[PDB]
């Protein structure tokens, strides 16, 4: 049935959403603590902190960076 | 209409899915490079690397850790 697929879709999407945003939220909360940790230990800017800032700043074209202008 | 909401749901869920998994994927790919970077610089296990491993290992109850048993 038409709506049977549609409602099953929201099932799969609910599931994908719950799988997705559960990790998106958890992973992102983790990311918030790494950024300020870089400024907590910039001072001693060891290689890891040079390659993980590269990590944090892994932006590319098509991707949005906030506070763009410096 | 019944299916009109349902198909609009998959719209919103598609949108949420695309917003979600685009970040879930991007953020997680970033996370893959931090974990091995910790073992790249464990040797010199500075505070950052003690607090970001806490980050990477921010697990709790209800959350699954792979390779559980050591």
């Amino acid at each position: 049935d038409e709506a049977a697929e549609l409602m099953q879709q929201v099932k799969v999407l609910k599931l994908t959403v719950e799988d997705l945003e559960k990790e998106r939220d958890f992973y992102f909360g983790k990311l918030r603590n790494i950024e300020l940790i870089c400024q907590e230990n910039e001072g001693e800017n060891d290689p890891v902190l040079q390659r993980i800032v590269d990590i944090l700043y892994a932006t590319d074209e098509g991707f949005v960076i906030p506070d763009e202008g410096g | 209409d019944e299916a009109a909401e349902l198909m609009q749901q998959v719209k919103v869920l598609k949108l949420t899915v695309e917003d979600l998994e685009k970040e879930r994927d991007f953020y997680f790919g970033k996370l893959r490079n931090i974990e091995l970077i910790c073992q790249e610089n464990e040797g010199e296990n500075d505070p950052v690397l003690q607090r970001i491993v806490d980050i990477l290992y921010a697990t709790d109850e209800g959350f699954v850790i792979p390779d559980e048993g050591g």
């Binding site: 990311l31 950024e35 300020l36 400024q39 960076i65 906030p66 506070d67 | 917003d19």
Partner: peptide
Amino acid sequence: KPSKIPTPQRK
């Protein structure tokens, strides 16, 4: 914390 890390715009 300093909102410079890549995002989407979204909302």
